[PDB]
From a paper:
The membrane domain of the mycobacterial ATP synthase is embedded in the IPM, with the catalytic F1-domain of the enzyme extending into the bacterial cytoplasm and attached to the membrane domain by a central stalk and a peripheral stalk (PS). The mycobacterial PS is made of two proteins, bδ and b′.
Protons cross the membrane via two half-channels at the interface between the rotating ring and the relatively static stator component of the ATP synthase, and they provide the energy from the pmf required to generate the turning of the rotor. In the mycobacterial enzyme, this inverted L-shaped half-channel is clearly present, but the water molecules that form the Grotthuss chain were not resolved. The mycobacterial inlet channel in the a-subunit contains the polar residues aHis12, aHis15, aHis16, aAsp30, aAsn104, aGln112, aAsp117, aGlu122, aLys125, aGln192, aLys219, aAsp222, and aGln229, which are probably involved in the coordination of the water molecules that form the Grotthuss chain. The proton inlet pathway then passes through a small aperture between α-helices aH5 and aH6 formed by residues aGly196 and aAsp222 into the interface between the a-subunit and the c-ring. As in the bovine and other ATP synthases, the outlet channel is more open and funnel-shaped. Polar residues aHis146, aArg153, aLys161, aHis166, aAsn174, aGlu177, aGlu178, aLys181, aSer184, aTyr240, aGln243, and aGlu246 are found in this region. In S2 (where there are no resolved substates) the c-ring has traveled two c-monomers further round (ca.120°), and in state 3 substates S3a to S3c have all traveled on to approximately the same position, four c-monomers (or ca. 280°) further on.
Residue numbers in the entry:
A (entry chain d): 1 to 58
B (entry chain H): 3 to 4, 20 to 54, 69 to 77
C (entry chain a): 10 to 247
D (entry chain G): 56 to 65, 220 to 233
E (entry chain Q), G (entry chain P), J (entry chain T), K (entry chain L), L (entry chain N), M (entry chain M): 3 to 86
F (entry chain R), H (entry chain S): 2 to 86
I (entry chain O): 3 to 85
N (entry chain b): 22 to 80
Amino acid sequence: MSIFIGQLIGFAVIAFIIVKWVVPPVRTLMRNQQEAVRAALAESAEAAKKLADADAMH
Amino acid sequence: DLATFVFTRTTAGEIGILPRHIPLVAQLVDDAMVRVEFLSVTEETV
Amino acid sequence: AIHVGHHTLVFELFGMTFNGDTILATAVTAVIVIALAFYLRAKVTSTGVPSGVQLFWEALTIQMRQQIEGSIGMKIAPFVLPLSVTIFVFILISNWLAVLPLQYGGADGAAAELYKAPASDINFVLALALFVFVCYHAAGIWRRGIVGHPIKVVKGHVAFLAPINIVEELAKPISLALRLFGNIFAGGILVALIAMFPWYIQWFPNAVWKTFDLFVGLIQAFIFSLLTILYFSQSMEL
Amino acid sequence: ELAGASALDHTLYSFEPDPETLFD
Amino acid sequence: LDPNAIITAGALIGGGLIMGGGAIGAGIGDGIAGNALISGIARQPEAQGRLFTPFFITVGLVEAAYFINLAFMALFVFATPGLQ
Amino acid sequence: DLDPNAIITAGALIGGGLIMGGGAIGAGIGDGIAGNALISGIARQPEAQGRLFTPFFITVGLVEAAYFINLAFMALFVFATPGLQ
Amino acid sequence: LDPNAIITAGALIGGGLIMGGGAIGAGIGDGIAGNALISGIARQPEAQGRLFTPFFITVGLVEAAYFINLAFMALFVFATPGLQ
Amino acid sequence: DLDPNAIITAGALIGGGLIMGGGAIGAGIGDGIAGNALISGIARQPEAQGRLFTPFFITVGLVEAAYFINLAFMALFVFATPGLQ
Amino acid sequence: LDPNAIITAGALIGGGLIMGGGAIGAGIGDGIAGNALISGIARQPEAQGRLFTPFFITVGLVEAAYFINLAFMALFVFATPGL
Amino acid sequence: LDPNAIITAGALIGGGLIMGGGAIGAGIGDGIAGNALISGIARQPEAQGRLFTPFFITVGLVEAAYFINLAFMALFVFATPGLQ
Amino acid sequence: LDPNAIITAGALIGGGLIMGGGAIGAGIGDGIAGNALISGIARQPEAQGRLFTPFFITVGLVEAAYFINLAFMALFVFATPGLQ
Amino acid sequence: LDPNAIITAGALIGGGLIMGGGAIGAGIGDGIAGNALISGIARQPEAQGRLFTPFFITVGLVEAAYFINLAFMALFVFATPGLQ
Amino acid sequence: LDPNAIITAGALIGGGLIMGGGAIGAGIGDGIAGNALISGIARQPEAQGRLFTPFFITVGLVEAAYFINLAFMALFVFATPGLQ
Amino acid sequence: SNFLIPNGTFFAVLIIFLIVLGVISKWVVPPISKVLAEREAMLAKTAADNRKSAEQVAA
């Protein structure tokens, strides 16, 4: 179990490093892609509105 | 044919261009001399 | 005391021996994959904001389709996309799960791990590689026919190097299998080897090697998928 | 071309001397 | 003369050769691929991301070679074929 | 007085060790060189990676062919040593 | 003859092979990566920050193999498989 | 006493190990270098590949030859060992 | 045949091999780094002062492998394990 | 112990080294010359006529040595000096 | 064991080793020189005539080493030093 | 059998390896450093002077390693530890 | 076994290694220096005179170690230290 | 203790992999392909709408 204790300590250190450094940027990319697709959807909606407007003026 | 040969001297070194030479842009040396039988070479012609 | 091999759980059926531990790891990975698949299906936000599962899956799909298209027409090889994404997720989860701290003392003065990466067994990589081999050779048969395909592969690029071409074919599957094995097998050895050190000194190198193992498993899964897609594309041309 | 293939802080074409070199 | 000793020493020498070859190949291939990566980065900073995907492919090859040989050493040293 | 087959097996093991040592060196170096070319080309022509991959992998397969031929012969040497009495 | 003599001599020679290969590979690969870095710096004085990240990416790979080899020699040297 | 034939078999096996080690190193390196050249050339001009294959498939064939023939010789070390009684 | 004589012979051969590999690595790496340095200084002489920063790392990160390797050779020759 | 036994074993090892070195040299030389030929042909197609001839020199200067080694390896495997 | 047999076997192994080393050196050198010559000719077709001059100056310096070994190789196998 | 003979043979093989590695390293490093210096001089005629100083830094390093190996092989051949 | 046979075999193999490594290093270094030189004349013919001075400086040094190695090799075969 | 010889496991593991492919070929990959295709179509149609609005207001 002494090897078990050492292994658990190593895994805890690995999780520490992950959550500390790698998690923030990956979540940042997650949020960036989510917001990019949401912005694309909003742009589609407003372009549809603008098409309706242009048809009305035309 | 691009002439069958164009000799010259560049900053990199002496360059002898043949008709199907790969495109190549280079500068001529201060005392550059060019013989025919800066420098820009295109796929079809110098 | 390393004890390389020696599958922890083994059973017998149909007059043949089977490795219980590798089947357990493979089943666990398959269950994780199925859980993610069902989560995606239930939470497909086509119009809504994509969730973690949705964005992860679509990122995998888009990357894989990009390599496929760069290799061969997507319509020419539609099944290649699902097959390759399947291989990628399967291998990635298999290798990643080894990061979990499932290593203990076996009461024999050595280190034994409850979870052993399924790729650490030659059977797993053999199955994956042979399946991929049959798959892309069948695709080649469909594209060129049963008779044209062997002649095409034998001819290859230059006739007078025919032997190498055959070797290349035989090099395709084996090359795919062995590397994966190694890429994971070393890990299985290394952790066990790392266990020889005292725990209060063993912890640190274990962590360093485990993060390196995460990176190695990721890159190996990526290259395995890319090699699969490439071999599919090469088998279907002219 | 060359500027597009160089740092701007003063059928590809082979720039025998280094692209930055030619600018000077 | 305990043929066991002779076969064990032969297996150890074989595994040492396995390691020598694998380490040499991996080190040199990694160095060369990294040289290419760094040169591409310096010449074209914009391609920083793009060059990563080919580079990791190349590594996956070269390292694989070394690692493949590693397994074989593990086969020789631990479960040596033809033992007495 | 020791068994001749033990000596033969030790010789076969050392031979196969050399087999795979040379194979590993060759494969690693050749693949690294090809990868360096691929990296340089992709850096030069940005989007040409898709087309460059197939000539790349022609050489990759060619290089790996020798490695795996040496694999086959290493297995031949070790699994069933030629002329093992 | 004592089996330990042959087994230990074989282990020593195998570990020596391991370190020879590891040193060769690490030195040459690291030198090549450094050559790339130096070329970048000379051609681009202000790129030192951008080129460092690829550099360590290469080194981490190269050195890793070497250290792997290092570790393995311990197993060969200190706890020789099949020692008897 | 030791059987001399066992010593001969072991020596021949080690010799063949060296044979294939050198052959694998040479073939891998030559293939990788010729590749690197081919990849770079095609990267410079895509269509150019149509012709660059010709010299490449020579050098490949010319280096693989130096392996294949070499291979035959190590077979002579194992299949029919010279000077074996 | 005394076991210790054989062990010492094997250890000496192993240390010789270790140091040969280390010398190969150190020499080739230093030569490559110096090649890069020479090219750089030829390109821009003023750069020389800064070029020593990465350069010393290379050799520093290369010679270490040699130096570390050297240390390991000692463990083979002066303290023959399992003699 | 049969003297011819050791003679032929050492001869086999020596011929192995002979052919290994020859194959390494020939392979590397052919690869380097082929890289040069590839680059030249890509650079100047019409130069092929004047490029194959110089190429056929170095390979001849390379293969020679390799083939020279063959001419000696046969010796060690068909007439080993000092056989007795 | 015949002392002459062991000495001659060691001599044969050493000669094979030395010839292999010379093979590697000559092959690498000749390939490199040929590559440089081919690149020069591709850059300057007209130059071929002058280019052969430095090339041979290199070739000797390479080739010579190879042939130098021959001498000592013979001394190892034919006139074995210290032969008993 | 005489232990001194075996230990002396081992030490001689060790020194052989020492100097093989040292010679390879010195030759390769010196050749590449040369190539760099000659290329630079070709590019820059007057620069030969200012180029010599860095060049001597390079060859000074590699040669030191080579010279170090000399000492060690001497230490092995002339003063063999544990000769007994 | 008589000691002299063992020490002689060890010395022969050791010297073979010495001068084989020397030959490999010398050949490859000569190839590299010759590549630099031949390319230089391929680029700047008039520079030949100023190229030879550094060229001979490097190649000679490349030879130096190799030639030095030969002496050590000759010491082993003929002046085997510790010969009984 | 070769642990390099194929075992019965070979078949068994294969089976599991197969079913996973089947799951991914029907309930994951096709829906994701549809999502990506419709997103791209949305982008293209939105660009077309913006343009047509431009030469409508111009018209």
